[PDB]
Amino acid sequence: KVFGRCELAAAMKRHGLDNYRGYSLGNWVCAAKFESNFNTQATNRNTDGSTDYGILQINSRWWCNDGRTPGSRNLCNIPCSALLSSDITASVNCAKKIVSDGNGMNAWVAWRNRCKGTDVQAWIRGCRL
């Protein structure tokens, strides 16, 4: 399901991502905007061979099991097929973990190269929350 912008912003807010670990809603929206275009059915095979999964783009090397990435850890304890569902509960329950590894949101390169240091509250501008 392709989530709108303010549409998504609301799904996160209630799932508990608005100020999780100290990162506002704006950072989260930006993350998936550049990592999937709000598309939750989005996947992308990485060079290392692992694949990214979800509207937050989460690889199977360190966070989920896809049944084809050798050296998997699956620290989230999931299948990566679950980060494709329209319901972003599992892609949120896992994002928290990743942002609590000690790297913060630096985990997402897209955020370190496109959202970090910019006006990110503009991503929730005009949304009724």
Which tokens sit at 65?
A: 């099991």
Please name the method used to determine this structure: neutron
Q: How far apart are the first and last CA of the chain?
A: 21
52 Cβ contact list (under 8 Å, min separation 6): 35, 42, 43, 44, 45, 46, 58, 59
Catalytic sites, residue numbers: 35, 52
What stretches of 5-129 show up as alpha helix (H) in DSSP? 5-15, 25-36, 89-98, 109-114
Domains and CATH numbers, the chain: 1-129 (1.10.530.10)
**Helix then strand then coil, % of the chain, to nearest 5:** 40, 10, 50
Query: Which residues define the annotated binding site for substrate?
Result: 101
Tokens 């959202």 belong to residue: 115
Neighbours of 113 (CB within 10 A): 9
Edge-first strand order for the sheet with 51-53 is 43-45, 51-53, 58-59
Structure tokens at 28: 């989260």
